[PDB]
Design a protein around this ligand. Structure first.
Ligand SMILES: O=S(=O)(O)[C@]1(CNC2CCCCC2)C[C@@H](O)[C@@H](O)C1
Ligand SMILES: O=S(=O)(O)CCNCc1cccc(Cl)c1
Length: 658
């Protein structure tokens, strides 16, 4: 259908524009579609882009508006006092502000559909909310509407919610256009999606992006595919990967690097209301926090992630137990059988389930996939699905049998409810992944395992050494391999923190010299240095010029291949803010060859200081551009839980940063 109204190049400079006579008499019927292309790179705290209102004395609460906040939140109000209706629908972190220093043209599509009684909002090709109501209010059936306004709402003759920005284009339709029609609307997005709702993972949520550039020129990415909202474990979460063979322009359909099957992979719209938003899938095993490295010697790609048995996150994870029993310098995975109060079993060589009380092997073995066999026959359990049909979260059996796994709730043999690290490998650069194996414990039998630092591991340039950073209370624990990940040793480096989430990433400044940047609890990013290829580590220093919150955020970091202003350069990705996870920056640092100190010279603002930016991944693409895959929202805020399609990818060039 053709628009009933179309207009453009409106400048909103804290003064509303009246389009009443152009628009009001064109509106008819009960369904409408608003299509608006708009910029706001210096928005006011709260502003209305578009308004329909009764502007008369005593009808201040009779209006329709599309508003935004300087946080990047978008929403609408639909209000009619006589009908007793005050609808308010919105979603945080829905907008872009600036990209490469230039105001982004956001494409907004709002559908008001009387037949389905549903209001639906899209921004930049992403559905950010879809709300169905009992009593529908057509946007132009509001009692006494007499104004159509851009850049404010006229209430009782005065300008409310004054906007600063521009509307390059606005169209209205006397129809609710289909989802199909919406998808044909052209966009000017500054970003791409690698992982997204409805893709092959069937996760509606994603967190913890990684990026790594392989020797073939393929760029590889991993991520938490999170099913039970954006919650950290306990939940259901898989690790998914995707790769690009054209310098990030296009990405493959995701596959899983690590997955469990005890719960269905379901795309669920997780509740965002204050009563139900902390609902959490509580009986599923999960993975969380992945990291990637490539091994020159073998050519293999290697991916680690934390593993959690059913119902377990770092919160309720059994500290003081590694989940392994030591017997003669050998570590064996412990198991507890259905009905026993203690762990009477261990998994010995050839997965033979061994009975520690009577020292006899049993007829049970554990296969490669940590699945349980009896006399060679595969045991099964019934899969669970989740739903909110009853009004609260329900987890229930769904009729499907899946292989019985020792990380499962319904398993006859269960591992220790604590956190593990798993490793998997790919021989085809991320086209398929092997079944994972658990790493051994590194800090002793009666210590729980360390926590993987998400992002990249480090492959030293001049050797076969592979390093993955992990953290635990009081130290960074570097995992080191010189044989393609077949065996690992620890290098402990104490840090001045108890119970920090010391997420650490490394760069090799020069042969043998590793600088590690890490999250702390001080509001500053810390670093330490090894001149030892990771054998030994310096004391801890802190970076000036960048602020974090008290709780901190993951920082990603690379050593750039080309010189900048004649110097070797390091690039940091982090939010820069003492208030929240926002104000995303790439910070370019030039190395001083004399002492390996770093002058943080250029700060590139990814988007507005007020717009969200949390965990991030950065890599130098083969063409020397920079790829950034990041959480474009505040992943700490309890107001921004369970948002879809907020982990986004951008391409930058060095000149943009400087
Ligand atoms: O130097 S590596 O550590 O092997 C690595 C890639 N270097 C190429 C060099 C050639 C240009 C693209 C990047 C940097 C890490 O951030 C990973 O992306 C892997
Ligand atoms: O700073 S955040 O809260 O956004 C994310 C911190 N995740 C830490 C963690 C690691 C492994 C398992 C679990 Cl359950 C939690």
């Amino acid at each position: 259908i053709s628009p009933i109204f179309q207009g453009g190049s409106y400048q909103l400079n804290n003064k509303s524009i009246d389009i009443s006579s152009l628009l009001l008499d064109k509106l008819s019927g009960e369904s409408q579609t608003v299509v608006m292309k708009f910029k706001a790179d210096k928005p006011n705290s709260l502003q209305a882009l578009f308004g329909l209102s009764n502007s008369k004395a005593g009808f201040k609460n009779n209006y329709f508006s599309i508003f935004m906040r300087d946080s990047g939140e978008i929403g609408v109000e639909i209000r009619d006092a006589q009908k007793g209706i005050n609808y308010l629908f919105s979603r945080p972190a829905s907008l872009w502000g600036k990209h490469k220093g230039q105001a982004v043209e956001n494409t907004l599509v709002f559908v008001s559909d009387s037949k389905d009684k549903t209001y639906t909002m899209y921004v930049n090709g992403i559905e950010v909310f879809s709300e169905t109501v009992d009593t529908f209010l057509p946007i132009s059936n509001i009692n006494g509407i007499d104004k159509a306004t851009l850049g404010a709402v006229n209430r009782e003759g005065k300008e409310h919610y004054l906007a600063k920005g521009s509307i390059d284009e606005i169209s209205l339709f006397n129809k609710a256009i289909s989802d199909q029609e919406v998808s044909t609307i052209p966009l000017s997005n500054p970003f791409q999606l690698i992982f997204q709702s409805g893709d092959s993972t069937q996760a509606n949520y994603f967190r913890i992006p990684t990026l790594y550039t392989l020797s073939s020129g393929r760029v590889l990415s991993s991520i938490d595919a999170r099913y039970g909202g954006t919650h950290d474990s306990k939940s259901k979460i898989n690790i998914a990967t995707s790769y690009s063979d054209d310098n990030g322009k296009t990405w493959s359909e995701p596959i899983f690097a690590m997955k469990f099957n005890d719960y269905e992979e379901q795309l669920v719209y997780w509740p965002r209301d204050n009563k139900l938003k902390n609902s959490q899938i509580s009986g599923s095993a999960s993975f969380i926090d992945s990291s990637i490295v490539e091994d020159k010697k073998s050519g293999k790609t290697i991916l680690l992630a934390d593993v959690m048995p059913a119902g377990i996150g770092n919160n309720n994870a059994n500290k003081a137990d590694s989940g392994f029993k030591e017997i003669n310098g050998h570590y064996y995975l412990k198991l507890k059988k259905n009905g026993d109060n203690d762990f009477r079993y261990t998994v010995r060589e050839n997965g033979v389930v061994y009975n520690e009380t009577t020292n006899k092997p049993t007829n049970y073995t554990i296969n490669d996939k940590y699945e349980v066999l009896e006399g060679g026959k595969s045991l099964t359990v019934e899969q669970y699905s989740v739903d909110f049909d009853s009004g609260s979260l329900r987890e229930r059996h769904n009729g499907k049998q899946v292989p019985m796994n020792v990380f499962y709730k319904d398993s006859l043999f269960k591992v220790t409810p604590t956190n593990y690290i798993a490793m998997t490998t790919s021989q085809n650069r991320g086209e398929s992944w092997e079944q994972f194996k658990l790493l051994p414990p590194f800090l002793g039998e009666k210590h729980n395992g360390t926590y993987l630092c998400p992002g990249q591991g480090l492959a030293l340039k001049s050797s076969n050494r592979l390093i993955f950073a992990t953290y635990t209370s009081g130290e960074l624990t570097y995992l080191i391999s010189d044989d393609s990940g077949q065996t690992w040793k620890k290098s402990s480096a104490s840090i001045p923190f108890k119970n920090a989430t010391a997420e650490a990433q490394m760069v090799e400044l020069r042969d043998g010299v590793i600088r590690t940047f890490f999250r702390t609890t001080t509001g500053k990013i810390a670093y330490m240095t090894s001149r030892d290829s990771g054998e030994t580590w310096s004391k801890v220093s802190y970076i000036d010029g960048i602020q974090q919150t008290s709780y901190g955020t993951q920082v990603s970091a690379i050593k750039y291949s080309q010189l900048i202003d004649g110097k070797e350069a390091v690039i940091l990705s982090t939010p820069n803010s003492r208030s929240g996870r926002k104000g995303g920056q790439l910070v370019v640092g030039l190395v001083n060859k004399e002492d390996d100190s770093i002058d943080w010279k250029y700060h590139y603002g990814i988007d507005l200081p007020s717009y969200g930016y949390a965990y991030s991944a950065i890599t130098e693409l083969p063409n020397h551009h920079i790829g950034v895959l990041f959480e474009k929202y505040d992943s700490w805020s309890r107001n921004e839980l369970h948002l879809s399609n907020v982990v986004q990818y951008i391409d930058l060039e060095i000149n943009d940063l400087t």
